[PDB]
């Protein structure tokens, strides 16, 4: 169908936009003097880089499922999504500690929370890919059900990161400080939309696609649609409002 030419365009424009916003963030690193909201900026740079990685990875699902592209998908998908949600979790934890009235974390500490929370997913993904490509049969003799089950089960730590970020961002809603509540509100909205999208495509891939007798014709389309849509949610519900808030300061 036309999903190979629409989504690719929706990828390509995204690849443009997440660069420009990246530039629109870097210049702000020369102009923001708050010492409390500046500490999140390297983490948001890493988040923008991970969104760019997601938009680039969408081509791996647009291009035919190959013995070359399957390790690329099975490694990069969970790793980049865990990087995004770990950056969101670090920002939400900084907001939790800021709304309560405590001194904000340094940017190095927030970057350590952003990177170290995504290292477990990196270890899991590299172990799975190395074991399949070395000890296994190089994805060759796997049924569509086996591949879908492995792809879903490989994302359990990412789902745990989603739930943890949801609860931590919800914890920002109470406290004596009110000017940090809007950042946590944006994070909460983004995580809720991401959770809804993830529930939708997991239910469609595991159960919806065999129900409509469209397996495995709809697997790569629903995963690519979910990838592009959630990357656009990351761009539009979190990054752009953060840019708007940081610009008027």
């Amino acid at each position: 169908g036309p999903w190979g030419i629409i989504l690719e365009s929706l990828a390509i424009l995204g690849i443009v936009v997440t660069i420009l916003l990246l530039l629109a963030f870097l210049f702000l690193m020369r102009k923001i003097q708050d010492c409390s909201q500046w500490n999140v900026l390297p983490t948001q740079l890493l988040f923008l880089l991970s969104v760019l990685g997601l938009f680039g990875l969408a081509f791996a699902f647009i291009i035919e499922l190959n013995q070359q592209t399957a390790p690329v998908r099975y490694f990069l998908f969970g790793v980049l999504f865990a990087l995004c949600f770990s950056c969101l979790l670090a920002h939400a934890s900084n907001l939790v500690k800021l709304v309560r009235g405590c001194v904000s974390f340094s940017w190095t500490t927030i970057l350590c929370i952003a990177i170290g929370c995504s290292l477990l997913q990196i270890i899991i993904a590299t172990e799975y890919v190395t074991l399949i490509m070395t000890r296994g049969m190089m994805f060759v003799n796997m049924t569509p059900c086996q591949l879908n089950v492995d792809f879903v089960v490989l994302l359990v730590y990412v789902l745990f990161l989603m739930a943890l970020t949801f609860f931590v961002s919800k914890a920002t809603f109470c406290g004596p400080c009110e000017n940090w509540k809007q950042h946590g509100r944006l994070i909460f909205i983004t995580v809720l939309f991401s959770i809804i999208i993830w529930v939708v495509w997991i239910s469609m891939l595991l159960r919806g696609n065999p129900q409509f007798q469209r397996q495995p014709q709809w697997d790569d389309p629903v995963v690519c649609i979910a990838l592009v849509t959630n990357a656009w949610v990351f761009l539009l519900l979190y990054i752009v409002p953060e840019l708007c808030i940081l610009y008027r300061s």
Partner: antibody
Amino acid sequence: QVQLVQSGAEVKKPGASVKVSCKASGYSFTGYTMNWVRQAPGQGLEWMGLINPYNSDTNYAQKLQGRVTMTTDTSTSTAYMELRSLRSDDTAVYYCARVALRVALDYWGQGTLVTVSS
Amino acid sequence: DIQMTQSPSSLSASVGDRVTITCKASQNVATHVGWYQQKPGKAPKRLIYSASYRYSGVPSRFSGSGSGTEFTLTISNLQPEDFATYYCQQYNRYPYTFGQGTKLEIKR
């Protein structure tokens, strides 16, 4: 779209070696494993081995090890199969079959007849 | 290796009849069974992969079913171009093994 074209039928002697080629077109040749399957006249299909064109890793059948050699050429995208020390029971039609993911042997060559007789 | 036995070796039927070919595996091969159709003088043609899925361009008359060590290919509405030799193949583990082949013949 996807096409696998082999060489012509060949007649050999029962002490020689045979090379069967398989030109692949219409797809990325590097990212798909190639099997070789032979069929005796009047008999069923018999699997011989595989080669991965990405790293030239081969896997042969137990009864054929020691005389079968599978190579690939990425520049021309052609898979070659060599059979040495031919016997009268090696007279068969040979097929190159491509393996894609989630599926089974979906694309086949037209078949090359090797006739081994003195 | 895994022995893959077909039943029957040859059966006769007419146009419009429904036929069933049974394939039995010595070991548990899950659902990693394909079905192929071969005409005299031509290469085998894909019919079924994963023991229940049809390739693109395969008519809906062919239907695969079964699991474990018991698999079944069913042709509902027989056609003159459907009379050929049918093979069941397993790809659960190497080496690949085929069936002996079931020849489909016109009954009169």
